[PDB]
Design a protein around this ligand. Sequence first.
Ligand SMILES: OC[C@H]1O[C@H](O[C@H]2[C@H](O)[C@@H](O)[C@H](O)O[C@@H]2CO)[C@H](O)[C@@H](O)[C@@H]1O
Ligand SMILES: OC[C@H]1O[C@H](O[C@H]2[C@H](O)[C@@H](O)[C@H](O)O[C@@H]2CO)[C@H](O)[C@@H](O)[C@@H]1O
Ligand SMILES: OC[C@H]1O[C@H](O)[C@H](O)[C@@H](O)[C@@H]1O
Ligand SMILES: [Ca+2]
Ligand SMILES: [Ca+2]
Length: 684
Amino acid sequence: DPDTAVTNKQSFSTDVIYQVFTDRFLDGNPSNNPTGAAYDATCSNLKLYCGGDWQGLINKINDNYFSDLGVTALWISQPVENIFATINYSGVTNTAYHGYWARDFKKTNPYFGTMADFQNLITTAHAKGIKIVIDFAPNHTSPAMETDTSFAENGRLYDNGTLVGGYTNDTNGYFHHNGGSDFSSLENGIYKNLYDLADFNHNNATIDKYFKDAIKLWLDMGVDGIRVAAVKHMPLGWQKSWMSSIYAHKPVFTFGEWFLGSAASDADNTDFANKSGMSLLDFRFNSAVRNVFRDNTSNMYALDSMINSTATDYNQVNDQVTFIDNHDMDRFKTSAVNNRRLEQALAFTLTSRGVPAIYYGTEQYLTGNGDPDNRAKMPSFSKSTTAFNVISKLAPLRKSNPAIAYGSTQQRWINNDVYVYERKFGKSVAVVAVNRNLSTSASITGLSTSLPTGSYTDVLGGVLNGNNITSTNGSINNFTLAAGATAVWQYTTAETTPTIGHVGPVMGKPGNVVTIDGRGFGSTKGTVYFGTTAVTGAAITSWEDTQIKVTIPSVAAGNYAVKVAASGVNSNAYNNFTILTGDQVTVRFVVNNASTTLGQNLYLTGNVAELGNWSTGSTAIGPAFNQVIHQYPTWYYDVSVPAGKQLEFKFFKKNGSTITWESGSNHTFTTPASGTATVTVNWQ
Ligand SMILES: OC[C@H]1O[C@H](O[C@H]2[C@H](O)[C@@H](O)[C@H](O)O[C@@H]2CO)[C@H](O)[C@@H](O)[C@@H]1O
Ligand SMILES: OC[C@H]1O[C@H](O[C@H]2[C@H](O)[C@@H](O)[C@H](O)O[C@@H]2CO)[C@H](O)[C@@H](O)[C@@H]1O
Ligand SMILES: OC[C@H]1O[C@H](O)[C@H](O)[C@@H](O)[C@@H]1O
Ligand SMILES: [Ca+2]
Ligand SMILES: [Ca+2]
């Protein structure tokens, strides 16, 4: 299958995601609707169910609404069973319509549908070439009050009907009872409750085993991707460990929600993206896009700078999910924002790097500020709006032009209001010009591109006032970019040299199968390179021009570059591919008496790649925590680490340059065969 098929659960670069709140889209089945205070047919009280379901989704798939719009994947509300109780917040009745207050991850929300409906949705979606991505929130159950079991459902958790435990009288410690996060530190938001949501204690082996089993079920149902909710609030170590379990079973594209409030780089965010095993929603791309297109608080340079900085910060920037709005923020469209601005923003998003996601209703210009107004019912299924048109013209390009899907980005011309960027990959090119000025046009002279000699036509057909151009060996002739104009020009050709577009996942242990997508691989099974190790033969489970599935070899745990040698020609190296020691388990390391100096931090390192292999640099573990679960001078940290292996490890203090290690011999511990563990040591 090509990189381009719906069969490609490992890569969404060629896809366009449509984010839909199941409840607010379409009620294909009224029989499954809630009753009483929980239901509102007019869908005027946005905190109540409105009946949207999977059958509604199925219906629109079948009448090609999505196929005509161009979207190739659907991201839906968390499918699991939620609390049935209603919650009264300062007089207002709230329901679990959003799907985020789960009570049983082994079952479906019956208001959405049944196992059969779900299986029917996956099949119908696949028959039309639409991948299905599910929201999943392993961070918590639902709102709960420790001192009041009657509020909501006391955050109870059921394992397929069977009660596992509630927040009150939690003798086994399935949850954290450290109060609620004040968001003052990273440690704080991880070990304390997100709002009033009962917080899971993933160090509890039952909870760790519940989530592995739970996700395994949905992957088996055929899901093609996962949106992990609130990744900033669970320990990276547990999630990494969970990610490898998924990748070892049935690898699917996985991205997570790490909320950022600006285009600015965040060290914790970058680390996560680069070390967890999953990618992230790009809140940095979102701020710059909104700042420039919607709010007018920044200009074209800001946009360009965000393109350059994120590409520098993330190991795989192409794995980041972009968007112009979502259910946790004001709809892009507002009274002061014009339609052309919304349309230009989509055009930018759809031709830029990453995996584009469109919040439902954008094409209908849906308005709505805040929660839940930004979660209004899908008002129309019109295929006439320009917004709708722009998406149907551009979306397919991610499929047809590999430069959009896998290419690099380069500025070709710019100023306060104008931005002309270029996407390239092999001989294929795509050039985009955006003039955000709604009242005045710009004379563009001296524009150079990679477009071979020839005259080009706007791929938008001029719907966004685009013009056609002429290149003379990349030299574009002077032209005027009309007001509020945006034109897309492109050039595509067959690649003749093996060239890697994407590898996914980019983490795994020996035995796992990874997918390498690109061009020019040829149809004659060659050799795949993991660093210096050449993988040939039956290990390469498939080999075609745009996709190779290959088994990760038994080489030392570490960082590698993937190269594909096709017919004697070696391709480009796809860097930072992480090979693990083997299966993971999550171990909490605790150290007593590690007192420090103003600005000194505690780290950890040991004899396995997962512990940094005695490194004190960016591969060491830390800085350790010292506030919630354990207080200074006791530090602790959850680390994904190989299973049933004997590790040697030592802690070290580091402020600036000076590294001070623990004296004595290394500490030792033999990690468990499965699940989780805790090992406490005293600073030597
Ligand atoms: O009950 C608190 C809030 O829970 C949800 O918020 C989600 C948010 O929308 C999602 O993107 C993030 O991943 O997790 C939080 C918590 O589950 C509801 O969507 C909100 O309306 C609630 O207020
Ligand atoms: O760097 C490889 C070795 O790291 C540790 O050795 C430390 C030692 O623990 C500490 O007392 C001394 O001051 O520095 C050395 C070197 O950094 C491990 O203990 C060894 O097993 C490793 O080979
Ligand atoms: O809307 C609720 C939000 O609360 C916090 O900002 C969390 O970081 C985020 O995960 C969640 O979306
Ligand atoms: Ca319904
Ligand atoms: Ca948490």
